[PDB]
Design a binder for this molecule. Structure first.
Ligand SMILES: [Mg+2]
Ligand SMILES: [Mg+2]
Ligand SMILES: [Mg+2]
Ligand SMILES: [Mg+2]
Ligand SMILES: [Mg+2]
Ligand SMILES: [Mg+2]
Ligand SMILES: [Mg+2]
Ligand SMILES: [Mg+2]
Ligand SMILES: [Mg+2]
Ligand SMILES: [Mg+2]
Ligand SMILES: [Mg+2]
Ligand SMILES: [Mg+2]
Ligand SMILES: [Mg+2]
Ligand SMILES: [Zn+2]
Lengths: 153, 292, 148, 166, 308, 108
RNA sequence: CACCAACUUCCUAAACUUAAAUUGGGUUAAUCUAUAACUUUAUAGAUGCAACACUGUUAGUAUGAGUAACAAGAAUUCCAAU
């Protein structure tokens, strides 16, 4: 009975759900790497990317400026979003934020966690997953097949 | 009778091991330090000529025993079950290492050796099967190839698909049995005695002995089967999960003696392959690949 | 108590009656007190009955060990190794004499529910009944509806 | 109170003859008066049964239950007192032979209710016992094959006797 | 450790192999599909003629959605769009083994990925030489109308006019109350009804001291296989293999269905006029138009309807 | 509704020892290549992740000292430099955070 | 043209002929004392002298049940903090 309802139910209601995401987003737009429960971090991820879309539009656009105010509680971050975050992402058209699952919380609450960040941040690189090198047994065999097929092609 | 050949070789193998162990009296502790990235700085005191690299893994944890295939003793690859000789540095190599060159070769030789064992005992006692050698082929070759000479009476018969399927069942049976490889260093004089009947094996033994300053030779035993080993092999057969004898092709320049190249594929439990990927690699192996 | 207890089949020690009957009771030991009312009845048994019993059964070694004691005790040992002890506290000579005679006659076999009154190693002489008995054969052994 | 699992760690066996099989080691460790339910603790104890100690120290680490950390601590004390004070050559040559949780001494308190009424509350404790035996985990139970199932039926029929007769 | 491990296709593939593997599989699917593109030139089974009492095979289609449609009488008929996608006969059982009086054919559709299927399913499809299909279904087919396994099926199997029947799983609505599931009236909201508004009434009779089996009680609704009968075929789009079926068809949009010739008595012998085994475009007996319409249907681009 | 009879330990032992109520074993545990500590395949390694976060806190603390106020976030790009490193020409006009320690291996 | 069927009756060994308020009779478990016995016994003298049942009293532990119910606004540079 909640089929196609993209949104979650968080906070004390619809408005509260909007105000909790405004705080994670402002922390993200400020620190560029923020932690939260997997559910809430994933809920924001859509909102996080769309700010860059408005930032790309530019300062002059009235709609971008107005939106950047409701979604940035601290008012020292609107200049940053437009003048450093937006220039960085001009080349890209998507994939602004990187989300990964940090182990469960060691709090006695034991909630699922995730770390969300902005790509190209100055902070130390996250321990991302690494796929096996082409030299590994299985990988090397496939490469031999590719060479054979490329010759056949 | 072939059964007699296996017994005498087995007995010779046991005698060579017994003298080596008896040759070493008392226990002399030798210092070996862990040089790997994780768990660095650990130092094991081990028994000379008795302790094995597997024991070093046993102290650290069960993960090293399960996931370690080879060990780098002072920058050289050594079999996990091969006893240590002197103080050195030990580094364990898994399959998923960034530079698995040594691991791949060890697995490569290992699989083709199990292939040789299957062939000799697969034939009927009426016919005559002799093993010449297996050429060292890069893993990129797409399959491991063992050359086997056959009796003239079989020169007109080529195995069918059913015959190829039978070999894999025997190969899988060896894998299921989970027989550890036995690593032995043998002087040429003893090695010739164990394989005097096989002229090609004798010639191969001569080449190995000539290469080294001494007459030391490398002998590996898989249960009953005994054969010379080019390089360090996998500790156990169970390390293999997928196995397949792709096809066998007669060597065209075999006028004096007919030889058939037995080509197969295998993948370890670690690096398992999906069904569709397995088929494509299997098909490639059927193509005959020459030795460069 | 039948379902609550063990059971066995009728049995002997070493096929007692096939050859020569051998007395199963092996030893009786009785401890008595010189000055004790409870053992008074047993003291009479030793005075008169014990000598007669010893001669009557010459395969039963009898040990009498008067000691300062509170309860006279008789311990019976059989040839199969089974032991049995019965309290003789304040029993008259008549009771002991009857009690001892039961011990001599019994064997070491356990006193538990005996499943069957009878035992045979060759129950059948003419051949144990099997389904094919009393069944007539047919010419060429043709099973019903077989054309042949 | 009765602390017998502690004493069993002090049993001394007589020396072996030159050809006797090498006796596997046994270790006896436990923790008492744990603030946890014995019923809740059993699920953690039951899980690890019949496993190695580097295979039971991995499953525990990623469990959310509070007892998982408590058990893990007594599976590391056992893994240390075995190598130092019971002569176990290899840390990775052990397996959890037995593991169970027992009731502890509890405390009685008052849980209040809504009409001047109440009920008796018990603050629950428990103990947790583990034995480690040197040697790889015994191979798992192999299900009976169809042939084995059929054989038992025949064996059952073969035992049949003519009942209630000579 | 020395225990069972969990793995998937991507776990080991490297960066370069990842794209190559996802590309090699795509190449194979095209080649396999092309191999079966010519049924009649691949040792087809004998094509027996039609006689009374024959039953044909049916297709499995994907439910794209709905759209309006008008007839030359001016009335609007809501019609649904069903797309046939890679509909290939898979297996052919014989009469006796099938356990029915009639034989049975399996008709799969909607090719899917190969990386998340059990090894047994992949092996069966490899022997058949076709890419795996999302769903299997069984069609009761007379011996005369049998088609060789692996024969591709297309929307030309049907023609405008024929009444057809569609069956598929209904939309799953989850655990629901007695009111919504069975349309129970319920209890009034006011006048003193205390905590009883949507609850079931009296379960059963008191004396029997039990509840009759099959009683209507709260439970999961939907996600149950259901069939709709007597649905006319308004139009057939050959190019995109789209059949226009009157009214509503069970299931959600993009849900696979089982289209089949109607079993109603009036539609007993409507298969005679249509292709008896099936239509084979590779045969090229006749080149059909892209869009096939029914006589009553008012085609677009025609003059506006005038009720003279 | 109240129980009409006490439930026996045999019936209780049937309900609470059912397979549905037991802990299901985890098959996705592995060994981190770098540190060797245990991790789930679809999750990051806590030991390695803790190193990154600990460095992040130190860097963020240094940033806080420099700014010295709530609303002092600089629009210009941020950058972190360690001892022995000097800003490049391409790095001109970028805020610099100074750290006494040497450049960590993971940091590039 | 009969068989099966209940300690009715017979038979080997025995026994000596019919629900419960009430009524007569013979013994026995435990403990203390007298006098003894001395691994736990005897004849007498005694008595707080025997509990599967009173919504009995006290203590302990189950069942319902690991159930009903209980609690901390977010991020960070972080718990006498922004
Ligand atoms: Mg729903
Ligand atoms: Mg949803
Ligand atoms: Mg009050
Ligand atoms: Mg209670
Ligand atoms: Mg109403
Ligand atoms: Mg109401
Ligand atoms: Mg009578
Ligand atoms: Mg009283
Ligand atoms: Mg009582
Ligand atoms: Mg009472
Ligand atoms: Mg309880
Ligand atoms: Mg309940
Ligand atoms: Mg609740
Ligand atoms: Zn790590």
């Amino acid at each position: 009975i909640s089929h196609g309802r993209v949104y979650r139910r968080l906070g004390l209601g619809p408005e509260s759900r909007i105000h909790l995401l405004r705080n994670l987003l402002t922390g993200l737009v400020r620190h560029e790497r923020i932690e939260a429960t997997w559910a809430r971090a994933d809920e924001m991820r859509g909102y996080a990317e769309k700010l860059i879309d408005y930032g790309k539009l530019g300062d002059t656009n009235e709609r971008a400026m107005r939106m950047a105010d409701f979604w940035l509680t601290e008012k020292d971050l609107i200049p940053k979003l437009f003048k450093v975050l937006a220039p960085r992402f001009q080349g890209q058209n998507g994939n602004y934020t990187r989300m990964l699952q940090i182990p469960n919380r060691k709090e006695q609450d034991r909630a699922k966690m995730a770390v969300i960040e902005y790509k190209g941040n100055y902070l130390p690189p996250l321990p991302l997953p690494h796929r096996d090198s082409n030299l590994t047994l299985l990988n090397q065999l496939l490469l031999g097949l590719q060479q054979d097929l490329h010759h056949n092609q | 009778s072939p059964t007699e050949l296996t017994e005498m070789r087995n007995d010779l193998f046991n005698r060579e091991k017994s003298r080596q162990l008896s040759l070493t009296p008392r226990t002399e502790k030798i210092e070996v330090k862990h040089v790997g990235k994780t768990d660095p700085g650990t130092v094991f005191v081990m028994n000379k000529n008795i302790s094995t690299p597997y024991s070093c893994a046993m102290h650290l944890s069960e993960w090293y025993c399960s996931k370690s295939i080879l060990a780098l003793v002072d920058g050289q690859p050594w079999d996990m079950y091969k006893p240590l000789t002197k103080s050195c540095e030990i580094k364990f190599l898994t399959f998923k290492d960034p530079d698995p060159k040594e691991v791949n070769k060890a697995y490569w030789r290992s699989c083709a050796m199990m292939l040789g064992c299957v062939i000799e005992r697969a034939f009927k006692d009426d016919y005559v099967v002799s093993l010449v050698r297996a050429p060292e082929v890069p893993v990129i070759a797409g399959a491991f190839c063992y050359d086997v000479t056959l009796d003239k009476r079989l020169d007109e018969w080529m195995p069918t698909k059913e015959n190829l399927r039978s070999f894999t069942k025997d190969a899988h049976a060896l894998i299921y049995r989970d027989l550890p490889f036995e690593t032995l260093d043998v002087d040429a004089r003893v090695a010739l005695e164990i394989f005097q009947h096989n002229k090609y094996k004798v010639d191969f033994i001569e080449e190995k002995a000539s290469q080294n300053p001494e007459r030391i030779v490398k002998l590996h035993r898989i249960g009953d089967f005994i054969d010379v080993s080019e390089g360090p092999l996998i500790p156990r057969t169970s390390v293999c999960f997928q196995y397949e004898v792709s096809a066998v092709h007669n060597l065209n320049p075999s006028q004096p003696n007919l030889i058939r190249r037995f080509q197969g594929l295998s993948l370890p439990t670690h690096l398992r392959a999906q069904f569709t990927i397995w088929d494509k690699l299997v098909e490639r192996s059927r193509k005959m690949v020459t030795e460069d | 108590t039948g379902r609550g207890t063990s059971s066995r089949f009728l049995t002997s020690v070493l096929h007692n009656g096939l050859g020569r009957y051998v007395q199963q009771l092996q030893r009786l030991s009785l401890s008595l007190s010189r000055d004790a009312p409870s053992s008074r009845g047993a003291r009479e048994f030793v005075e008169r009955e014990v000598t007669d019993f010893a001669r009557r059964n010459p395969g039963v070694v009898v040990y009498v060990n008067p000691r300062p004691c509170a309860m006279p005790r008789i311990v019976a040992e059989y040839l199969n190794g089974a032991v049995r002890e019965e309290n003789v506290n304040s029993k008259s000579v008549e009771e002991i004499k009857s009690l001892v005679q039961k011990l001599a006659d019994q064997s070491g076999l356990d006193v538990i529910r005996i499943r069957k009154p009878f035992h045979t190693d060759n129950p059948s002489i003419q051949g144990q009944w099997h389904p094919f008995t009393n069944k007539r054969t047919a010419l060429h052994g043709l099973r019903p509806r077989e054309l042949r | 109170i009765s602390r017998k699992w502690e004493k069993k760690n002090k049993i001394v066996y007589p020396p072996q003859l030159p050809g006797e099989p090498r006796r596997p080691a046994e270790i006896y460790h436990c923790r008492r008066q744990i603030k946890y339910s014995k019923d809740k603790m059993w699920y953690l104890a039951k899980m690890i049964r019949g496993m190695s100690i580097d295979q039971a120290l991995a499953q525990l680490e990623f469990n959310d239950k509070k007892g998982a950390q408590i058990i893990k601590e007594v599976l590391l004390e056992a893994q240390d007192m075995a190598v130092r004070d019971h002569n176990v050559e290899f840390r990775s040559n052990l397996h959890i032979a037995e593991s169970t949780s027992g009731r502890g001494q509890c405390l009685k308190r008052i849980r209040y209710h809504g009409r001047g009424r109440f009920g008796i509350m018990e603050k629950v404790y428990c103990h947790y016992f583990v034995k480690l035996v040197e040697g790889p985990p015994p191979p798992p139970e192999v299900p009976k094959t169809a042939v084995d199932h059929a054989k038992d039926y025949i064996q059952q029929l073969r035992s049949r006797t003519i009942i209630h007769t000579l | 450790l020395h225990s069972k491990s969990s793995t998937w296709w991507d776990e080991h593939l490297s960066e370069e192999n990842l794209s190559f593997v996802k590309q090699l599989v795509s190449d194979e699917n095209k080649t396999q599909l092309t191999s079966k593109l010519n049924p009649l030139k691949d040792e087809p089974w004998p094509l027996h003629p039609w006689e009374p009492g024959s039953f044909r095979v049916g297709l499995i289609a994907l439910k794209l959605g709905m759209m309006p449609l008008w007839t030359k009488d001016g009335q609007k008929h809501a019609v649904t769009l069903l797309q046939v996608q890679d509909c290939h006969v898979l297996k052919y059982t014989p009469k006796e083994d099938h356990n029915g009086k009639i034989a049975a054919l399996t008709v799969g559709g909607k090719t899917v990925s190969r990386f998340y299927k059990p090894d047994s399913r992949l092996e069966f499809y490899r022997d058949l030489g076709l890419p795996p299909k999302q769903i299997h279904k069984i069609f009761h087919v007379t011996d005369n109308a049998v088609i060789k396994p692996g024969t591709p099926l297309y929307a030309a199997h049907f023609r405008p006019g024929q009444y057809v029947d569609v069956t598929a799983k209904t939309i799953g609505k989850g655990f629901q109350g007695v009111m919504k599931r069975w349309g129970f009236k319920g209890q009034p909201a006011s006048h003193g009804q205390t905590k009883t508004h949507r609850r079931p009434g009296a379960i059963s009779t008191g004396d029997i001291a039990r509840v009759w089996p099959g009683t209507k009680m709260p439970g999961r609704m939907g996600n149950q296989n259901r069939t709709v009968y007597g649905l006319k075929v308004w139009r057939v789009n050959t190019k995109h293999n789209i059949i226009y079926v009157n009214g509503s068809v069970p299931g959600h949009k993009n849900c696979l269905v089982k289209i089949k010739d109607s079993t109603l008595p009036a539609y007993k012998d409507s298969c005679k006029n249509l292709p008896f085994p099936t239509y084979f475009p590779d045969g090229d007996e006749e080149e059909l138009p892209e869009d096939l319409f029914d006589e009553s249907v008012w085609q677009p681009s025609e003059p506006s309807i005038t009720f003279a | 509704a109240a129980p009409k009879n006490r439930r026996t330990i045999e019936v209780n032992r049937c309900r609470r020892r059912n397979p549905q109520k037991l802990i299901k074993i985890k098959n996705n545990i592995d060994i981190c290549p770098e540190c060797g500590h245990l991790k789930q395949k679809h999750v990051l390694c806590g030991y390695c992740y803790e190193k990154v976060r600990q460095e992040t806190t130190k860097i963020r603390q240094q940033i806080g000292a420099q700014e010295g106020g709530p609303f002092r976030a600089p629009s210009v790009e941020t950058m972190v430099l360690y001892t022995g490193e000097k800003p490049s020409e391409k790095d001109q006009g970028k805020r610099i955070v100074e750290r006494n320690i040497k450049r960590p291996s993971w940091f590039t």
